Write a protein that holds these residues in place. Structure first.
Motif, PDB file in Angstrom:
ATOM      1  N   UNK D  10      -6.450  -1.445  12.983  1.00 18.44           N
ATOM      2  CA  UNK D  10      -5.987  -0.160  12.473  1.00 18.44           C
ATOM      3  C   UNK D  10      -5.871  -0.242  10.958  1.00 18.44           C
ATOM      4  N   UNK D  12      -3.345   0.761   7.447  1.00 23.53           N
ATOM      5  CA  UNK D  12      -1.919   0.606   7.179  1.00 23.53           C
ATOM      6  C   UNK D  12      -1.385   1.585   6.140  1.00 23.53           C
TER       7      UNK D  12
ATOM      8  N   UNK G  10      -0.436  -7.851  16.094  1.00 24.22           N
ATOM      9  CA  UNK G  10      -1.574  -6.950  15.967  1.00 24.22           C
ATOM     10  C   UNK G  10      -2.270  -7.215  14.640  1.00 24.22           C
ATOM     11  N   UNK G  11      -3.336  -6.457  14.395  1.00 24.50           N
ATOM     12  CA  UNK G  11      -4.119  -6.546  13.172  1.00 24.50           C
ATOM     13  C   UNK G  11      -3.991  -5.244  12.391  1.00 24.50           C
ATOM     14  N   UNK G  12      -4.117  -5.337  11.065  1.00 27.85           N
ATOM     15  CA  UNK G  12      -3.687  -4.257  10.184  1.00 27.85           C
ATOM     16  C   UNK G  12      -4.840  -3.555   9.474  1.00 27.85           C
ATOM     17  N   UNK G  13      -5.676  -4.285   8.723  1.00 26.62           N
ATOM     18  CA  UNK G  13      -6.704  -3.670   7.883  1.00 26.62           C
ATOM     19  C   UNK G  13      -6.058  -2.704   6.892  1.00 26.62           C
ATOM     20  N   UNK G  14      -5.405  -3.226   5.834  1.00 22.92           N
ATOM     21  CA  UNK G  14      -4.603  -2.390   4.922  1.00 22.92           C
ATOM     22  C   UNK G  14      -5.193  -1.038   4.535  1.00 22.92           C
ATOM     23  N   UNK G  15      -6.421  -1.015   4.009  1.00 23.19           N
ATOM     24  CA  UNK G  15      -7.098   0.220   3.604  1.00 23.19           C
ATOM     25  C   UNK G  15      -6.262   0.954   2.544  1.00 23.19           C
ATOM     26  N   UNK G  16      -6.221   0.328   1.364  1.00 24.48           N
ATOM     27  CA  UNK G  16      -5.411   0.837   0.259  1.00 24.48           C
ATOM     28  C   UNK G  16      -5.864   2.214  -0.218  1.00 24.48           C
ATOM     29  N   UNK G  18      -8.242   4.433   1.237  1.00 23.96           N
ATOM     30  CA  UNK G  18      -8.498   5.456   2.226  1.00 23.96           C
ATOM     31  C   UNK G  18      -9.973   5.778   2.387  1.00 23.96           C
TER      32      UNK G  18
ATOM     33  N   UNK H  12       2.397  -8.167  12.039  1.00 19.02           N
ATOM     34  CA  UNK H  12       1.215  -7.471  11.543  1.00 19.02           C
ATOM     35  C   UNK H  12      -0.076  -8.264  11.714  1.00 19.02           C
ATOM     36  N   UNK H  13      -0.158  -9.488  11.172  1.00 19.48           N
ATOM     37  CA  UNK H  13      -1.409 -10.246  11.149  1.00 19.48           C
ATOM     38  C   UNK H  13      -2.491  -9.444  10.428  1.00 19.48           C
ATOM     39  N   UNK H  14      -2.431  -9.367   9.084  1.00 13.01           N
ATOM     40  CA  UNK H  14      -3.320  -8.479   8.312  1.00 13.01           C
ATOM     41  C   UNK H  14      -4.776  -8.412   8.758  1.00 13.01           C
TER      42      UNK H  14
END
Lengths: 270, 140, 49, 278, 278, 108, 56, 56
Positions: D10, D12, G10-16, G18, H12-14
């Protein structure tokens, strides 16, 4: 003569209606034409944040014994914005005639003095910034915000104390305890290198039903206080190189009870 | 030791049909002592602006009428201490009586006014062997 | 809209009333500003009989 | 650590500082209490007085009357003379000068004027009330005129614009409300650049101003102009050349008043006027 | 990696350190056990004694009696003399000096006093019990007076304030409970700035204090004042001028006791008083 | 605007360089978040505006501000900048298609 | 802080920054208004002329 | 910003770079199209010859 007596009650309820100018015709779907939403409630409006009174520590740089070299900088402030101007006590220029409060008039210090009672919590947001003016930048450090409860003896004063931490052989476990306390109802802690902002909400805890929103003296409003302190390295004892930015809003139970009257005001410049 | 009651004020005026004057009587609730040294520095005309927004009454001299004021018990505690040395009763309210329109007369020179007061729903509690506030005859 | 709480409590009374010791009589009407108090069941602490 | 996670990833959007503009979304803050459900009352009844409603509603400011000023009649007045002139907008200042011994200044606003300062646009109706202070042997007649736009630089007719004729008899204390009569939906809010605001209404005895000439040119913030003219001369039993009569006026907001904006003009004002001159 | 994610993004608020103030929200910590569900019992019965209830409830501290001190009667006493005087608040210290051979100091508190130290506000009732140690041939009568506020600097009447008259006959060990009689909802909690606290009650034979004069001025932390006066002189068969009698008193907390705050005044005290003088 | 003096930060100059921000500011720290997303409403008091406007100030009737606080800057150089990406909001509207105006090839 | 969390990570994938290419997914932006539901009309009729359809 | 959040935290686990080994889990990528649902056919018949089955 009956018509002259009934028309003298307070509020003008005995006045003669005089077939007003024009008519009132407003449709419900006028908000969808202009501005999108409505602004009829002041309780909702006061839940937004407003900039107020960036906090510094430029008052202890006068005495020639302030510690340097990884010390702790602490500021104690009231729980309310403490309206702008040359208030009698003043946190910004105490050891100089006519101390003042270098702040801005927010949405909380404008609508409050028109009331009798005040009760509820306040929300704050502190944002950290700071440089070194040469002596190439050091890491941010640690920041804490904790409450100061009421005690009949030995309560913490208001603002701007500095405490040392090191000695000839480095860190001392003893001085590290004299610069802190139990924090039994207080501290929220964080590291400013990965998180520079602090969000906190402070409850009322008054033991009284309310307080006076027309208070002006800095210490009178300072009956409920809290403290923001930061741990930083490679500091100078005669300079102020760190500060916080304060944004103030209203809590979930903020209340104002009786609308008495609108007080005077003026244009104040510093 | 403690008391809790509501204030009732009443004004009595007497003037002829040759006077055509007006006066204002206002009340300020608990908390007025803090802004008292500054409120006395405001001109009478500007003071009437703020008094008209508070519980008040208007006194008419062309007629002879006006004056009844019921006030509630507003306090951040449950009761007020009435023992000796107490300053709590002297901080619960204030009555202002200033001119709105100057008194005139149709010639071809003095009016009077009197104010009463009493209490209702009185509650006396906390028996004690302590003397009350030092009694004093009203100044006028 | 809410009540004006100043010109929402105004009303006119007769100039005749009694208080078990002082009775006043007059023929002109008066003006009243009656602000009522609250119930407050939590305001009765030191109540004995 | 027996199984493995096979859920999709997902995005963040960290949002370190949070939302400081909206006032309806939840907040991720740290309450400094023991429990997360601590809460007081919003009763308005715990202070000792019965509540007529939510005192934090803006309607409680639009609807609180206030005495402004006085003007004279001066029975030695011709049949058509200007007695009063004002702009129909809630921002009407009043400046005083600290009667007691010091130098200090201040300003005052009506409850309607006070509440629209933090806003930038306003619309709705306003209510005016005039009360004549005279005896039982005074007779006369007055006129009230409204001009939607342009101002009244000269005495108007009797039916070209809206007019009202009222007589001083056994009844006084007349009130009238002006509605919205502009071609635009919203108007602007007046501000002041200094500590001595310009005159917004003509003679007021409290502020020491007695010029009877008509001021104007405030079209972009106001909802027209109100004027008061004589119709029938004031009659007194004693005799003129030394007799006057005073009229008091009050301002209010009609139940159709409205404000919709957010402004930062009051950001450097203060309610502490006590000692600021030194 | 066949499909793609089309869900909207979100906001995070990292919160590296966590919440250290609330006590009802879950925590993201790492249990250093084998399973995540490891758990012991909260029975209170696994130690060998049957439990009367939750011993971690604060009610178990408000309700545990404690002997404080003693005072004398001294039959050669006039008909109205002060015998005892105390402040009605739970923080009553007792200081000792390490009878054995060394220099050490310490302090003691009742179970009610101990539990309200980590708090800042208190309210409720307190219970007192007086027991007279006399033979079967002693006769007398005593008085107990309560003053809600101000103190008793002089001998009061008999009905101006609350009074009780009790007689020394075939019955002793009287108890009485004082309720809340203040105009405020909560009071403050007493603290001490040094190792020798000020006197809170008048003569106590254990602490070597024998002054019968009334102390006072502690209105902001207490719930009034208790006093003991003679009514009828003590009568003994042998003969006075050398005979006394001792009375012991105990303190407790009524079932309406309450504390609501959090304080950090005990942050530098310690229960290790053994060797701290050197 | 300046912020410092002989003895470091001044609480007075820090207020002259800011305002109430009663309907404005969104704040962030550029060390952990370099981008800013904002949506600005209409708030016109009129029904519409002219999309054929060309003058810079005529379109500048509704304005906003972007400001940054940085250290160790030079007074005669420009060493910071922002990249602006513009889209349309959730209520963007265009009402009456009149005609297609002229155009040309412009180079700077 | 009584219980503990036993949910899987879980996993994040920041995506600063957008998504700046699609035009159908929701956006994580900060509306500079008072409420989050402020909205005007898309009527095409508020200008004074009847609309024959979507002019966009 | 009226209420407060009382939900428990999480982990989180980025996972900055993503999963490059499996071939059955969804991916957090940015499609450079107008819509997020753009898609062609897998018919094998759009080239001009009838398909006997999945040629892949």
């Amino acid at each position: 003569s009956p018509l002259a007596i009934a028309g003298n009650r307070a509020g003008g309820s005995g006045a003669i209606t005089l077939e007003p100018f024009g008519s009132d015709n407003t449709s419900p779907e006028l908000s969808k034409l202009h501005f999108g939403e409505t602004y009829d409630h002041m309780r909702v409006l006061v839940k937004g944040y407003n900039f107020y009174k960036a906090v510094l520590d430029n008052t202890t740089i006068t005495d020639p014994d302030n510690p340097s070299g990884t010390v702790v900088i602490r500021s104690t402030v009231p729980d309310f914005p403490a309206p702008r101007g040359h208030i009698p006590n003043g946190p910004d220029k105490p050891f100089l005639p006519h101390p003042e409060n270098a702040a801005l008039c927010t949405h909380l210090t404008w609508f409050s003095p028109c009331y009798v009672a005040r009760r509820g919590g306040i929300r704050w947001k502190y944002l950290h910034f700071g440089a070194r003016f040469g002596a190439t930048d050091a890491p941010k450090g640690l920041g804490f915000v904790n409450r100061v409860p009421q005690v009949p003896y030995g309560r913490r004063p208001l603002g701007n104390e500095r405490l040392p931490l090191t000695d000839v052989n480095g860190f001392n476990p003893t001085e590290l305890s004299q610069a802190f306390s139990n924090e039994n109802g207080g501290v929220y802690a964080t590291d400013l290198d990965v998180q520079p902002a602090i969000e906190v909400e402070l409850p009322f805890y008054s033991s009284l039903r309310f307080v006076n929103p027309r208070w002006d003296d800095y210490e009178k409003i300072g009956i409920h206080r809290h403290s923001i302190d930061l741990l930083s390295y490679r500091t100078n004892g005669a300079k102020c190189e760190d500060a916080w930015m304060a944004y103030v809003a209203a809590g979930d139970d903020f209340n104002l009870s009786w609308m008495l009257s609108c007080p005077p005001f003026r244009l104040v410049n510093l | 030791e403690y008391l809790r009651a509501n204030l009732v004020l009443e004004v009595v005026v007497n003037g002829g049909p040759f006077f055509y004057g007006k006066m204002l009587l206002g009340y300020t609730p608990f908390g007025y002592e803090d802004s008292l040294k500054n409120f006395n520095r405001i001109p009478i005309g500007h003071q009437n602006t703020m008094l008209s927004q508070q519980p008040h009454v208007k006194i008419d001299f062309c007629e002879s009428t006006g004056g009844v004021l019921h006030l509630p018990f507003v306090y951040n505690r449950n009761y007020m201490r009435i023992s000796e040395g107490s300053g709590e009763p002297a901080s619960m309210g204030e009555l202002r009586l200033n001119t709105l329109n100057a008194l005139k007369n149709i010639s071809f020179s003095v009016a009077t006014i009197t104010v009463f007061a009493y209490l209702d729903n009185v509650e006396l509690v906390a028996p004690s062997a302590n003397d009350p506030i030092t009694a004093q005859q009203p100044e006028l | 809209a809410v009540k004006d709480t100043i010109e929402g409590n105004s009303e006119t009374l007769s100039g005749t009333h009694q208080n078990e010791t002082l009775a006043l009589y007059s023929n002109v009407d008066q003006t009243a500003v009656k602000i009522m108090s609250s119930i407050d069941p939590t305001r009765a602490d030191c109540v004995s009989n | 650590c027996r199984p493995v996670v096979i859920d999709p990833p997902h995005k963040y959007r960290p949002t370190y500082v949070g939302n400081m503009a909206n006032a309806d979304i939840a907040e991720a803050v740290d309450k400094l209490s023991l429990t997360s459900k601590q809460e007081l009352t919003i009763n308005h009844d715990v202070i000792g007085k019965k509540s007529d409603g939510d005192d934090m509603h803006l309607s409680t400011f639009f609807g609180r009357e206030a005495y402004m000023d006085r003007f004279e009649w001066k029975t030695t007045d011709s049949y058509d003379t200007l007695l009063f002139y004002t702009h129909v907008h809630p921002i009407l200042f009043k400046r005083f000068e600290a009667t007691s011994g010091d130098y200090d200044v201040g300003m005052l606003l009506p409850p309607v004027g006070y509440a629209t300062i933090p806003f930038s646009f306003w619309r709705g109706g306003m209510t005016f009330r005039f009360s004549i202070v005279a005896s039982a042997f005074h007779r006369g007649r007055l006129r009230i005129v409204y001009q939607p736009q342009g101002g009244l630089g000269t005495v108007p007719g009797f039916s070209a614009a809206f007019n009202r004729v009222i007589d001083l008899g056994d009844a006084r204390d007349f009130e009238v409300t002006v509605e919205w009569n502009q071609n635009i939906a919203f108007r602007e809010v007046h501000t002041t650049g200094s500590n001595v605001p310009s005159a917004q209404y003509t003679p007021g005895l409290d502020v020491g101003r007695t010029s009877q000439l008509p001021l104007g040119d405030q079209t972009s913030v106001s909802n027209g102009v109100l004027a008061v003219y004589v119709v029938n001369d004031l009659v007194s039993p004693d005799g003129g050349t030394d007799e006057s009569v005073e009229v008091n006026w009050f301002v209010k907001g009609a139940p159709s008043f409205e404000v919709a904006s957010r402004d930062t003009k009051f950001a450097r004002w203060s309610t502490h006027w006590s000692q600021e001159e030194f």
